[PDB]
Amino acid sequence: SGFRKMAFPSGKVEGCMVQVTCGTTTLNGLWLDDVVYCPRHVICTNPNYEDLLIRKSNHNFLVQAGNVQLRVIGHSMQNCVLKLKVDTANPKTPKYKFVRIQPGQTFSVLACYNGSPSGVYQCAMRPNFTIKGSFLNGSCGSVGFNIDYDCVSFCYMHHMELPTGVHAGTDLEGNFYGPFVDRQTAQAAGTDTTITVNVLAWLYAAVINGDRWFLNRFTTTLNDFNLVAMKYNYEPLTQDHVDILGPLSAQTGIAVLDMCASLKELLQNGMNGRTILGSALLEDEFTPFDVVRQCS
Amino acid sequence: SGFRKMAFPSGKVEGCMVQVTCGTTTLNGLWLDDVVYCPRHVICTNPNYEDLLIRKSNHNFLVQAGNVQLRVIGHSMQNCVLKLKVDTANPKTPKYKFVRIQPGQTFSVLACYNGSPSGVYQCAMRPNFTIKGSFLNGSCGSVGFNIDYDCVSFCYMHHMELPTGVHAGTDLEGNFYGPFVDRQTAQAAGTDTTITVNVLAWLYAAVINGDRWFLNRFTTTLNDFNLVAMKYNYEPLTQDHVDILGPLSAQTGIAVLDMCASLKELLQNGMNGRTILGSALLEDEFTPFDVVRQCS
């Protein structure tokens, strides 16, 4: 019983975190095999990064793994990440993949400062390709990930804070999520929407944990529900979403379109002072997978 | 910027988690130096635990650390925990302490099944000595902890789920938090209250992150505020609480008793459709320390 924002255990990622310094800029890097990955903006002091990097040498990069200095033997740029080749392969490299996630999907963030892990939390990639993280100065290069069996799938590297306080970054190939750039501009998050399939997943989590007051005998049609979704700035629900919710629908015996009728009622009338899983708002940062992982 | 429920990095605890089996009961143990700690109820099949343990031998305990079987060479009971002496000291033992926490304090939980860590999240010890965790069958023996510098302070070991779905357990000396027992009874959580100092800390976090709509020019007296606290089932605010909130008050320039006037207004009128740090409820599971750790 219970339902919490739950991160993956962070140990396998902790052993990959290092400190990268170039000039007076210090941030975090990810050390896998004999390569350290970090945001290329570490070499800034607008910019032409190819020019900036041509003017650097291996010795301009100080990489510290705990108390051990790692000698940089090569440097290159891949999109918005820097790859520093070091003379030592990380003995704690986990089995890993570089994956790009989709908006609506969740991942764990290991927030890090000066190469030292500080905390772990769960984030969702928002429809507008920002994340609502918790980052302070020095956190660039912190990574996001999911773990399956023994394999770490890295999906996010932190690069910047946008004016509204939300966060933007890249996949581990250095390609930004969303229409953001690692230079100084007036860039801002675009309009966002609520992740409908996740809200439904969380309502199923609530039912599994004994919250039933929002249930009703009605069922709606997919088309009728999607009219309501559009009105309340919710993402369209697809037949694939309905299919993905199948197992949760079966376990609870509440058909997906039956739960959609509950969600319509909640959107049109609110909660009348009640709560669901300890929240007075509809929660959209749990995927169906997240619910199945913790509720079963 | 941002404010998340954030756990400590769990790696140092992951390397201490083992599987303990006795009979047909499997649960988790904590392996520090050459001792494995686990709930004594693993030896159950009402009970007289001293009798149950006299009837056991070392060979009745199977301890598995990943793929390695650890040979049990001694067994004893300490309050509600079992101490299994094994022939191998854990090479990954961190610097650690066994500390008992107070209601209102927070800690990270490494939820574990079959000795395998599954996820990490933050919990608070409720005033009624339960925690609102996320645990499924098999999670007994999962631990709660805080980390300071390199030192793991273990404060909680999971033993049971109470009828309302909240959770009860012991410190690592085997002494229960709260009026709960590791036998079959109709025991239930007592009445709870809201942790006032934590609500105020979270309001300061909100101000630091730019939420100001609940602020006002008024200040209240400690006595007048505590009259309102009692009416809304909030814990009394003490001068020590005011002192602990000092640094956050200074950083924001909002005196504690000024923020107390905001909290009084919020309790008496609600939020009028607005939110604070993404919540439509007053959040009480962040301590002043938690706020200072993530906001600074």
Residue numbers in the entry:
A (entry chain A), B (entry chain A): 1 to 45, 51 to 301
Quote the passages of the study that discuss this structure, keeping the authors' original sentences:
Inhibiting the catalytic activity of 3CLpro has been proven to be an effective strategy to block coronavirus replication. In this study, we have identified mutations in SARS-CoV-2 3CLpro that confer resistance to WU-04. To understand how these mutations affect the WU-04 sensitivity and the catalytic activity of 3CLpro, we solved the crystal structures of these mutants and aligned them with the crystal structure of the WT 3CLpro.
In the crystal structure of the M49K mutant, three regions around the substrate-binding pocket show conformational changes in comparison with the structure of the WT 3CLpro. One is the short helix (residues 45–51) in which the M49K mutation is located. Both show slight conformational changes upon introducing the M49K mutation. Particularly, this mutation destabilizes the short helix of 3CLpro containing residues 45–51, resulting in alterations to the conformation of the WU-04-binding pocket and thereby explaining the resistance to WU-04. Crystallographic analysis indicates that the M49K mutation destabilizes the WU-04-binding pocket, impacting the binding of WU-04 more significantly than the binding of 3CLpro substrates. We purified the WT 3CLpro and the WU-04-resistant mutants and measured their inhibition by WU-04 using a fluorescence-based enzyme assay. Both the M49K and M165V mutations increased the IC50 of WU-04 against 3CLpro by more than 20-fold. The S301P mutant showed a significantly decreased dimerization ability (Kd = 17.81 ± 7.32 nM) compared to the WT 3CLpro (Kd = 0.94 ± 0.21 nM). In our cell-based assay that was designed to evaluate the self-cleavage efficiency of 3CLpro, the M49K mutation resulted in a nearly 20-fold increase in the IC50 of WU-04 but had negligible effect on the efficacy of ensitrelvir.
